[PDB]
């Protein structure tokens, strides 16, 4: 098989490189919850996102379902952006 080479910049590696956005250190996956007193993965078990879902009151249609929808919209937008970049 030929040698592997696939160099696309996906427009994020272009924007981030025109200016000086460096990559992140990729240290850990946990955050610190304050009341409670645990380390509560940011995403990976009951992630801090999926917390307004089971909150026992929201203090303003159900707002928690609207929050879920607003998250899903960004997820689908990210997937669409990826598909567009890969088509470029």
């Amino acid at each position: 098989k030929p040698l592997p080479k696939a160099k696309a910049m996906t427009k994020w590696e272009k924007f981030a490189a025109k200016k000086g956005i460096k990559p992140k250190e990729r240290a850990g996956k946990m955050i610190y919850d304050e009341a409670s007193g645990e380390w509560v993965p940011k995403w990976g078990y009951k992630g801090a996102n999926k917390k307004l879902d089971d909150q026992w009151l929201v203090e303003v249609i159900d707002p928690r379902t609207l929050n879920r929808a607003e998250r899903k919209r960004l997820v689908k937008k990210n997937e669409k952006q990826q598909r567009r970049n890969m088509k470029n």
Binding site: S36, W56, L57, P63
Partner: protein, 119 residues
């Protein structure tokens, strides 16, 4: 337990997030997964309303207006009787009163003296 728009309920959570926990308001919405209450909060010296959105199982009906109804029906009865005859019936309630005179008896009960204890 099934709630209607306008009924009265109290908040009761079965930890450290937020504590109303024992207030009382009126249902102003009933969605499929939750219910919505309003609560008049004392903003310094004014009563401004907060619209909270609870869940289903964290709310129960209230009995803060059962005694009024039961007493009105008992009063209907008493006034039916007070028209059936010429009777002073004295419907009004009365605050607890001071006691009257009595005579205790030391027959099988001799007073036993007791002093305080050491250290």
């Amino acid at each position: 337990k099934v709630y209607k728009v306008g009924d009265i309920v109290d908040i009761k959570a079965n930890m450290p997030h937020k504590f109303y926990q024992g207030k009382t308001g009126v249902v102003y919405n009933v969605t499929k997964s939750s219910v919505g209450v309003i609560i008049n909060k004392m903003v310094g010296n004014r009563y401004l309303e907060k619209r909270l959105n609870l869940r289903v199982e964290h709310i129960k009906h209230s009995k803060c207006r059962q005694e009024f109804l039961e007493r009105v029906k008992a009063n209907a009865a008493k006034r039916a009787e007070a028209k059936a005859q010429g009777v002073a019936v004295q419907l009004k309630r009365q605050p607890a009163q001071p006691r009257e005179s009595r005579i205790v008896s030391t027959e099988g009960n001799v007073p036993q003296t007791l002093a305080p204890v050491p250290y």
